[PDB]
Design an enzyme around this catalytic site. Structure first.
Site, PDB file in Angstrom:
ATOM      1  N   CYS A 117     -29.394  45.458 -26.683  1.00  0.00           N
ATOM      2  CA  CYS A 117     -29.337  45.620 -25.193  1.00  0.00           C
ATOM      3  C   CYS A 117     -29.000  44.360 -24.418  1.00  0.00           C
ATOM      4  O   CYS A 117     -29.620  44.158 -23.359  1.00  0.00           O
ATOM      5  CB  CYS A 117     -30.657  46.193 -24.625  1.00  0.00           C
ATOM      6  SG  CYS A 117     -30.630  47.975 -24.791  1.00  0.00           S
ATOM      7  N   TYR A 173     -29.732  44.972 -20.457  1.00  0.00           N
ATOM      8  CA  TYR A 173     -28.743  45.942 -19.938  1.00  0.00           C
ATOM      9  C   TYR A 173     -27.957  45.436 -18.722  1.00  0.00           C
ATOM     10  O   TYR A 173     -27.241  46.232 -18.110  1.00  0.00           O
ATOM     11  CB  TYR A 173     -29.194  47.357 -19.701  1.00  0.00           C
ATOM     12  CG  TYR A 173     -29.544  48.228 -20.854  1.00  0.00           C
ATOM     13  CD1 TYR A 173     -29.772  47.705 -22.127  1.00  0.00           C
ATOM     14  CD2 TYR A 173     -29.671  49.593 -20.604  1.00  0.00           C
ATOM     15  CE1 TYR A 173     -30.151  48.599 -23.138  1.00  0.00           C
ATOM     16  CE2 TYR A 173     -29.975  50.498 -21.619  1.00  0.00           C
ATOM     17  CZ  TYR A 173     -30.223  49.926 -22.871  1.00  0.00           C
ATOM     18  OH  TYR A 173     -30.551  50.733 -23.903  1.00  0.00           O
ATOM     19  N   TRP A 198     -33.515  46.736 -17.736  1.00  0.00           N
ATOM     20  CA  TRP A 198     -33.979  47.473 -18.945  1.00  0.00           C
ATOM     21  C   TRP A 198     -35.161  46.756 -19.611  1.00  0.00           C
ATOM     22  O   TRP A 198     -36.092  47.325 -20.253  1.00  0.00           O
ATOM     23  CB  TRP A 198     -32.804  47.691 -19.954  1.00  0.00           C
ATOM     24  CG  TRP A 198     -33.214  48.445 -21.175  1.00  0.00           C
ATOM     25  CD1 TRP A 198     -33.286  49.812 -21.286  1.00  0.00           C
ATOM     26  CD2 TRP A 198     -33.645  47.914 -22.446  1.00  0.00           C
ATOM     27  NE1 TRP A 198     -33.730  50.184 -22.556  1.00  0.00           N
ATOM     28  CE2 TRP A 198     -33.944  49.039 -23.270  1.00  0.00           C
ATOM     29  CE3 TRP A 198     -33.781  46.633 -22.967  1.00  0.00           C
ATOM     30  CZ2 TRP A 198     -34.382  48.913 -24.601  1.00  0.00           C
ATOM     31  CZ3 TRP A 198     -34.170  46.482 -24.315  1.00  0.00           C
ATOM     32  CH2 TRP A 198     -34.472  47.600 -25.070  1.00  0.00           C
ATOM     33  N   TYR A 228     -23.972  57.973 -27.005  1.00  0.00           N
ATOM     34  CA  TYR A 228     -24.731  56.784 -26.654  1.00  0.00           C
ATOM     35  C   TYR A 228     -24.834  55.805 -27.816  1.00  0.00           C
ATOM     36  O   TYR A 228     -25.112  56.179 -28.985  1.00  0.00           O
ATOM     37  CB  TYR A 228     -26.170  57.244 -26.203  1.00  0.00           C
ATOM     38  CG  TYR A 228     -26.961  56.167 -25.496  1.00  0.00           C
ATOM     39  CD1 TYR A 228     -26.445  55.584 -24.342  1.00  0.00           C
ATOM     40  CD2 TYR A 228     -28.148  55.694 -26.010  1.00  0.00           C
ATOM     41  CE1 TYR A 228     -27.122  54.555 -23.695  1.00  0.00           C
ATOM     42  CE2 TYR A 228     -28.905  54.709 -25.309  1.00  0.00           C
ATOM     43  CZ  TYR A 228     -28.365  54.156 -24.152  1.00  0.00           C
ATOM     44  OH  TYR A 228     -29.047  53.155 -23.512  1.00  0.00           O
ATOM     45  N   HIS A 229     -24.615  54.528 -27.474  1.00  0.00           N
ATOM     46  CA  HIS A 229     -24.637  53.407 -28.346  1.00  0.00           C
ATOM     47  C   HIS A 229     -23.415  53.279 -29.321  1.00  0.00           C
ATOM     48  O   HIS A 229     -23.526  52.624 -30.397  1.00  0.00           O
ATOM     49  CB  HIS A 229     -25.888  53.376 -29.257  1.00  0.00           C
ATOM     50  CG  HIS A 229     -27.070  52.863 -28.475  1.00  0.00           C
ATOM     51  ND1 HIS A 229     -28.326  53.160 -28.975  1.00  0.00           N
ATOM     52  CD2 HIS A 229     -27.231  52.181 -27.296  1.00  0.00           C
ATOM     53  CE1 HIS A 229     -29.247  52.635 -28.168  1.00  0.00           C
ATOM     54  NE2 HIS A 229     -28.623  52.083 -27.169  1.00  0.00           N
ATOM     55  N   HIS A 235     -22.983  49.437 -25.097  1.00  0.00           N
ATOM     56  CA  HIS A 235     -23.404  50.298 -23.979  1.00  0.00           C
ATOM     57  C   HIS A 235     -22.344  50.625 -22.920  1.00  0.00           C
ATOM     58  O   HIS A 235     -22.659  50.764 -21.715  1.00  0.00           O
ATOM     59  CB  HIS A 235     -24.634  49.636 -23.305  1.00  0.00           C
ATOM     60  CG  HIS A 235     -25.873  49.720 -24.187  1.00  0.00           C
ATOM     61  ND1 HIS A 235     -26.169  48.874 -25.256  1.00  0.00           N
ATOM     62  CD2 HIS A 235     -26.921  50.593 -24.084  1.00  0.00           C
ATOM     63  CE1 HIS A 235     -27.308  49.176 -25.804  1.00  0.00           C
ATOM     64  NE2 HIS A 235     -27.752  50.149 -25.098  1.00  0.00           N
TER      65      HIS A 235
HETATM   66 CU   LIG Z   1     -29.514  51.322 -25.419  1.00  0.00          CU
END
Ligand SMILES: [Cu+2]
Ligand code: NA
Length: 639
Positions: A228, A272, A290, A495-496, A581
């Site tokens: 992240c 993030y 985040w 996601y990711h 991300h």
């Molecule tokens: Cu994440």
């Protein structure tokens, strides 16, 4: 956990061959249905033959194969765990061809998979190149082959996906190592999870496109769990990794020495946030709630020369917040940042409000208006993507995303933003008729020709769930203001997931998951080969070659002279990317104007504005009249 993309094929009729098999460990123990029994190569008194070891299956008939699973020995002993491997398909048993998948599996006893695009085959072969601990055996408790419901041949002229690169980790963050051409990937303190990190360690893995070797390395020297983070390639060509699991840390990856160096701690802990390299090689970051707490995190700037982070309190985060229903925890995340002229940073979204960030004095922020067009004001597009495909003309393509980070429908919105001087309101228009497919968590890269490749995502953002997946990638062609669907892939990338442009002109797409026990971890990547690498016949086209470069290090405003082996019509410079991300603030393209010196000799000037030609490493590509690009030449742009 992980999962295969197809359904298990019936093992009744199979015929299997092994290079060696110790009595008690027969070839067929691998296909008995008993997890307690396993094929084992010769050992002790039969000798200890070193790998490669091979497992060949004859399905007797033709199946539409899309993968395989490998359950290691489950008796507590590690001997024979497959490390490096290759998977081949054959309709005849003699002609294999190139591996459909290859890479390395992590050293554990979990079931491992190879997921790859569907290919009719009767024979399957798994080659164990290495044993996970460097021993000579190969052992397999159970082996399964999966099939797709159907087989649909890729359409000609629409690119091709494959092969699959199998990895020991979920590559949720990646970067190209510019001096080596290797893809650097990292996860967290674990190969498949980030929740529960004691902090301080990061597992990394690299793939070398030239050798096909996948390697893994744990990094602890920077005392940073790099999940992240903010990622930027600074002015020196060092990759600056900030925050995330260890919210105040900064780690520097030096491609040259292939090492990790501890950097200074940021002033504000974040996770993030997006970070962006500036016209002067410095790195600006803002937001990031985040990790490190949820509060207003204004700007800060890193100076590679003094190795300090300096707070820019007046570079306020407030004007860029989205209206996320989860509040500040998400609203200041993954800003669409771009370093621009004169130390400025443009924020294109995701909020509807766009802003100019200034880094002189204690910082400043000025409104750049709203992302909008004749169709209306664009809503917030969290996890939408933004790509600067023509830095000379200040063109940014934005697309996709949803109002909220999760539990929100993605959209087909797409806009072209054209930047002028900092402090001015850029012009924004709608791009064509928008994406063919609404998506969020998708990834994208700008290609050598100025087209944008867009892939993966889902229609409704639900982290860690492979629902409403979009398997059809799209390319935007700026010259035509048109989007084109490409051939579809078979692996969900939500996601990711990540995408990077490789120096050979192909796209590396992978990841997705990183949720420990979930079955949605994807420990792989696939390669997409754009149609510009094929000729009319479906074969790979012949590529121009750059036979010489006057220099490989140039100051903005500088000239470079090259010789090629064929007449070239176009050239472009593509800055090396970093990704995580959905954010990639390092890639950008500069179209070059070539002076034909006669004799397949050409010169060009790198733009003199370092806010256009951001310092760092760039890839030089030349294209022939056919549109086929050369493999890149790496150039370092200094201010
Ligand atoms: Cu994440
Ligand atoms: Na077995």
């Amino acid at each position: 956990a992980s999962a295969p993309i197809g359904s298990a094929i019936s093992r009744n009729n199979w015929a299997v061959t092994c290079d060696s098999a110790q009595s008690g460990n027969e070839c067929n123990k691998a296909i008995d249905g008993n997890k307690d029994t396993f094929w084992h190569t010769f050992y002790g008194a039969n000798g200890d033959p070193k790998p490669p070891h091979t497992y060949t299956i004859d399905m007797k008939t033709t199946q539409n194969v899309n993968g395989l699973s490998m359950l290691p020995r489950q008796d507590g002993n590690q001997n024979g765990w497959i490390g490096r491997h290759e998977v081949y398909l054959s309709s005849d048993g003699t002609n294999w061809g190139s591996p459909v998948a290859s890479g390395s599996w992590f050293a554990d006893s979990t079931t491992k998979y190879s997921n790859f695009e569907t290919r009719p085959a009767r024979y399957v072969r798994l080659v164990a190149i290495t044993e996970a601990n460097g021993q000579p055996w190969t052992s397999i408790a159970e082996i399964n082959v999966f099939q797709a419901s159907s087989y649909t041949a890729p359409q000609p002229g629409l690119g091709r996906w494959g092969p699959t690169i199998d990895l020991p980790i979920v590559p949720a963050a990646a970067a190209i190592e510019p001096t080596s051409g290797r893809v650097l990937m990292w996860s967290s303190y674990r190969n498949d999870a980030f929740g529960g990190s004691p902090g301080g360690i990061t597992l990394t893995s690299s793939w070398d496109p030239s050798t096909g070797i996948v390697s893994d390395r744990t990094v602890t020297v920077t005392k940073h769990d790099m999940f992240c983070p903010g990622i930027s390639m600074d002015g020196n060509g060092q990759i600056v990794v900030t925050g995330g699991n260890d919210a105040k840390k900064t780690s520097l990856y030096d491609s040259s020495s292939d090492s990790w160096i501890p950097g200074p701690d940021m002033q504000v802990a974040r996770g993030y946030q997006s970070s962006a390299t500036m016209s002067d090689g410095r790195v600006f970051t803002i937001g990031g709630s985040w990790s490190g707490g949820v509060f207003e995190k204004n700007g800060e700037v890193y100076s590679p020369s003094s190795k300090t982070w300096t707070s820019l309190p007046n570079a306020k985060v407030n004007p860029m917040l989205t209206a996320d229903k989860q509040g500040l925890y998400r609203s200041d995340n993954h800003a669409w940042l771009f370093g621009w002229k004169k130390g400025s940073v443009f924020q294109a979204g995701p909020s509807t409000a766009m802003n100019w960030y200034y880094t002189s004095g204690s910082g400043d922020v000025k409104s750049a208006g709203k992302r909008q067009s004749n169709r209306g004001v664009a809503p917030d597009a969290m996890c939408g993507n933004a790509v600067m495909y023509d830095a000379v003309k200040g063109k940014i393509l934005t697309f996709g995303g949803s109002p909220d980070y999760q539990d929100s429908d993605a959209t087909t919105n797409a806009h072209i933003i054209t930047l002028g001087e900092p402090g001015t309101s850029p012009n924004t228009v709608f791009a064509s008729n928008g994406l063919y497919f609404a998506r969020t968590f998708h990834t994208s890269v700008v290609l050598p020709d100025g087209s944008t490749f867009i892939t993966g995502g889902q229609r409704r953002g639900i982290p860690f769930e492979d629902s409403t997946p979009v398997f059809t990638p799209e390319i935007y062609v700026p010259e035509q203001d048109t989007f084109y669907k490409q051939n579809p892939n078979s692996i969900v990338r939500v996601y990711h997931s990540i995408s990077l442009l490789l120096p050979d002109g192909r796209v590396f797409n992978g990841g997705g998951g990183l949720c420990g026990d979930c079955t949605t971890n994807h420990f792989d990547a696939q390669i997409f080969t754009p149609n510009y690498l094929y000729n009319s016949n479906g074969n790979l086209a012949t590529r121009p070659k750059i036979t010489r470069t006057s220099t490989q290090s140039v100051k903005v405003g500088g000239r470079i002279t090259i010789s090629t082996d064929s007449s070239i019509s176009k050239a472009s410079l593509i800055r090396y990317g970093t990704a995580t991300h959905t954010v990639n603030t390092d890639q950008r393209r500069i179209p070059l104007t070539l002076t034909n010196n006669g004799g397949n000799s050409y010169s060009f000037q790198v733009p003199s504005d370092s806010g256009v030609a951001l310092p760092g490493y760039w890839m030089l590509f030349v294209m022939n009249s056919a549109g086929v690009p050369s493999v890149a030449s790496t150039i370092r742009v200094t201010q």
